[PDB]
């Protein structure tokens, strides 16, 4: 599923993401925007290390979900990577929360550093009623 901007904002808000571990909803929106373009079906295989990024947040198989084909990988979210490809983003959100409970927080995703950090991210939630 390809979410529309405000649709996703409210969906994320309902799932308890607004300010989760100090991360504003606009930051989450900026992350999803740059990671998948708000696409829950998005996948990116990393030929370099044999891992794959899954879903709207492009969560990596090396540490967060199990796809059974990533060398010495682990499953921190305790989910099949398949769960990160659902139209319903509840599992992906639970996993995204798990990622940020680690020291780096939102900085875990390099794309967030490149495209969202120290940026005016207000435009992501404007007019969405969140």
UniProtKB/Swiss-Prot annotation:
Domain C-type lysozyme: 1-130
InterPro entries: Glyco_hydro_22, Glyco_hydro_22_CS, Glyco_hydro_22_lys, Lysozyme-like_dom_sf
EC number(s) given by UniProt: 3.2.1.17
Domain of life per record: Eukaryota
Miscellaneous comment text of the record: Lysozyme C is capable of both hydrolysis and transglycosylation; it also shows a slight esterase activity. It acts rapidly on both peptide-substituted and unsubstituted peptidoglycan, and slowly on chitin oligosaccharides.
Oligomeric form and interacting partners: Monomer.
Designated name of the protein: Lysozyme C
Gene: LYZ
